[PDB]
Design an enzyme around this catalytic site. Structure first.
Site, PDB file in Angstrom:
ATOM      1  N   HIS A  40       0.810  -1.207   0.000  1.00 53.50           N
ATOM      2  CA  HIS A  40       0.000   0.000   0.000  1.00 53.50           C
ATOM      3  C   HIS A  40       0.852   1.269   0.000  1.00 53.50           C
ATOM      4  CE1 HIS A  40       0.160   0.249   4.574  1.00 53.50           C
ATOM      5  NE2 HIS A  40       0.167   1.536   4.250  1.00 53.50           N
ATOM      6  N   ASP A  84      -0.195  -7.553   1.756  1.00 49.64           N
ATOM      7  CA  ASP A  84       0.308  -6.165   1.775  1.00 49.64           C
ATOM      8  C   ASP A  84       1.832  -6.170   1.916  1.00 49.64           C
ATOM      9  OD1 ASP A  84       0.468  -3.432   1.727  1.00 49.64           O
ATOM     10  OD2 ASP A  84      -0.436  -3.137   3.742  1.00 49.64           O
ATOM     11  N   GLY A 175       2.500   6.523   8.639  1.00 49.08           N
ATOM     12  CA  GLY A 175       3.902   6.867   8.391  1.00 49.08           C
ATOM     13  C   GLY A 175       4.863   5.768   8.827  1.00 49.08           C
ATOM     14  N   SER A 177       3.948   2.630   8.215  1.00 48.50           N
ATOM     15  CA  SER A 177       3.603   1.608   7.257  1.00 48.50           C
ATOM     16  C   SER A 177       4.794   1.210   6.396  1.00 48.50           C
ATOM     17  CB  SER A 177       2.502   2.086   6.328  1.00 48.50           C
ATOM     18  OG  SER A 177       1.272   2.213   7.030  1.00 48.50           O
ATOM     19  N   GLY A 178       4.883  -0.104   6.150  1.00 52.20           N
ATOM     20  CA  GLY A 178       5.969  -0.654   5.355  1.00 52.20           C
ATOM     21  C   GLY A 178       7.177  -1.028   6.184  1.00 52.20           C
TER      22      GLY A 178
HETATM   23  C1  LIG Z   1      -3.492  -0.444   4.474  1.00 52.78           C
HETATM   24  O1  LIG Z   1      -3.536   0.599   3.491  1.00 52.78           O
HETATM   25  C2  LIG Z   1      -3.307   1.856   3.940  1.00 52.78           C
HETATM   26  C3  LIG Z   1      -3.332   2.880   2.995  1.00 52.78           C
HETATM   27  C4  LIG Z   1      -3.042   4.156   3.452  1.00 52.78           C
HETATM   28  C5  LIG Z   1      -2.764   4.420   4.836  1.00 52.78           C
HETATM   29  C6  LIG Z   1      -2.280   5.768   5.144  1.00 52.78           C
HETATM   30  C7  LIG Z   1      -3.166   6.830   4.987  1.00 52.78           C
HETATM   31  C8  LIG Z   1      -2.748   8.128   5.242  1.00 52.78           C
HETATM   32  C9  LIG Z   1      -1.472   8.370   5.622  1.00 52.78           C
HETATM   33  C10 LIG Z   1      -1.018   9.671   5.949  1.00 52.78           C
HETATM   34  O2  LIG Z   1      -1.937  10.315   6.469  1.00 52.78           O
HETATM   35  N1  LIG Z   1       0.259  10.007   5.572  1.00 52.78           N
HETATM   36  C11 LIG Z   1       0.897  11.289   6.005  1.00 52.78           C
HETATM   37  C12 LIG Z   1       0.564  12.447   5.131  1.00 52.78           C
HETATM   38  O3  LIG Z   1      -0.829  12.845   5.162  1.00 52.78           O
HETATM   39  C13 LIG Z   1       2.274  11.109   6.693  1.00 52.78           C
HETATM   40  C14 LIG Z   1       2.822  12.437   7.192  1.00 52.78           C
HETATM   41  C15 LIG Z   1       2.114  10.159   7.905  1.00 52.78           C
HETATM   42  C16 LIG Z   1       3.375  10.629   5.686  1.00 52.78           C
HETATM   43  C17 LIG Z   1      -0.596   7.293   5.934  1.00 52.78           C
HETATM   44  C18 LIG Z   1      -0.985   6.011   5.676  1.00 52.78           C
HETATM   45  C19 LIG Z   1       0.018   4.899   5.869  1.00 52.78           C
HETATM   46  O4  LIG Z   1       0.203   4.110   4.933  1.00 52.78           O
HETATM   47  O5  LIG Z   1       0.640   4.856   6.930  1.00 52.78           O
HETATM   48  C20 LIG Z   1      -2.720   3.369   5.665  1.00 52.78           C
HETATM   49  C21 LIG Z   1      -2.595   3.404   7.096  1.00 52.78           C
HETATM   50  O6  LIG Z   1      -3.134   4.232   7.700  1.00 52.78           O
HETATM   51  N2  LIG Z   1      -2.009   2.372   7.716  1.00 52.78           N
HETATM   52  C22 LIG Z   1      -1.930   2.167   9.097  1.00 52.78           C
HETATM   53  C23 LIG Z   1      -0.899   1.395   9.586  1.00 52.78           C
HETATM   54  C24 LIG Z   1      -0.839   1.062  10.928  1.00 52.78           C
HETATM   55  C25 LIG Z   1      -1.830   1.474  11.805  1.00 52.78           C
HETATM   56  C26 LIG Z   1      -1.784   1.085  13.209  1.00 52.78           C
HETATM   57  N3  LIG Z   1      -0.972   0.121  13.627  1.00 52.78           N
HETATM   58  N4  LIG Z   1      -2.561   1.688  14.098  1.00 52.78           N
HETATM   59  C27 LIG Z   1      -2.848   2.288  11.320  1.00 52.78           C
HETATM   60  C28 LIG Z   1      -2.904   2.617   9.982  1.00 52.78           C
HETATM   61  N5  LIG Z   1      -3.024   2.085   5.242  1.00 52.78           N
END
Ligand SMILES: COc1ccc(-c2ccc(C(=O)N[C@H](CO)C(C)(C)C)cc2C(=O)O)c(C(=O)Nc2ccc(C(=N)N)cc2)n1
Ligand SMILES: COc1ccc(-c2ccc(C(=O)N[C@H](CO)C(C)(C)C)cc2C(=O)O)c(C(=O)Nc2ccc(C(=N)N)cc2)n1
Ligand SMILES: [Ca+2]
Length: 223
Positions: A40, A84, A175, A177-178
């Protein structure tokens, strides 16, 4: 990482930051040319940043290398979140050293209750946002499949496990993630999903890396 601690510079030498002019996901170095992350996190313009502690300051141990290939699992499903996992190839090999080093793939799956190290530069608050400069770390146990399925009815596949703390307060977050879940020196998990962050009864959900070792090895061998 919510409820974690400051790891210490280059204490997690397999941790990478995926950067597109800002940090957006973690990953784990598995050899000089390949990083494991979450499907993702796929996007264009990825630069892999190795040897990082403070992601906002040049400290002297970084290696910045463009991704040349991004290979999502063939059966990743962005709805169910099954499979994933993604492999990123570096355009040129990293120089392995004490601060830039790989993590081992599992030879067997980890048991429930196994204690693991989860790390990343994701949000550190359960409400609101705060993004750290330096790498954060959390010790967290793998939960039983029954507790995981109770937490997320109908959602947990054989390629997922839960880890964390059912009281809340300690979790990975956006953030992260991965990035890695490392248990007894093996990459057992990839930060995948959850419900909010560090909420009661809503543990983190992680890609179960031990199911993918053959796929990883074969993919590296063919690309
Ligand atoms: C599974 O597919 C996706 C797709 C997208 C997201 C995602 C959405 C928004 C954002 C996000 O808001 N990113 C910002 C910019 O707006 C950062 C500053 C954190 C880079 C991050 C993520 C992510 O991948 O971590 C995520 C996502 O939110 N994943 C995620 C991972 C772990 C937990 C947990 N252990 N509580 C919760 C949530 N997941
Ligand atoms: C796919 O799996 C998951 C699992 C969890 C999340 C998630 C994680 C944290 C949060 C969240 O509450 N994050 C921080 C924590 O402090 C806020 C302050 C922004 C609420 C929200 C969500 C959500 O479901 O919307 C997400 C997630 O953030 N998904 C997502 C999807 C689309 C968009 C968009 N087009 N605007 C944005 C975000 N995705
Ligand atoms: Ca830096």
């Amino acid at each position: 990482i919510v409820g974690g601690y400051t790891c210490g510079a280059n204490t997690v030498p397999y941790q990478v930051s995926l950067n597109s002019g800002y940090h957006f996901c973690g990953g784990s170095l598995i050899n000089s040319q390949w990083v494991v992350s979450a499907a993702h996190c796929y996007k264009s313009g990825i630069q892999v940043r190795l040897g990082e502690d403070n992601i906002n300051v040049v400290e002297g141990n970084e290696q910045f290398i463009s991704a040349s290939k991004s290979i999502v699992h063939p059966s990743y499903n962005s709805n169910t979140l099954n499979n994933d996992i993604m492999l990123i190839k570096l355009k040129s090999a990293a120089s392995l050293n004490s601060r830039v080093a790989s993590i081992s793939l599992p030879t067997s799956c980890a048991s429930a209750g196994t204690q693991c190290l989860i790390s990343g530069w994701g949000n550190t608050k359960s409400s609101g946002t705060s993004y750290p400069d330096v790498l954060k770390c959390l010790k967290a146990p793998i939960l039983s499949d029954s507790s995981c399925k109770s937490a997320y009815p109908g959602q947990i596949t054989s390629n997922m496990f839960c880890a964390g703390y059912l009281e809340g307060g300690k979790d990975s977050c956006q953030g992260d993630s991965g990035g890695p879940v490392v248990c007894s020196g093996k990459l057992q998990g990839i930060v995948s999903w959850g419900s909010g962050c560090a909420q009661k009864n809503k543990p983190g959900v992680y890609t179960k890396v031990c199911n993918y070792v053959s796929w990883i090895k074969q993919t590296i061998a063919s690309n």
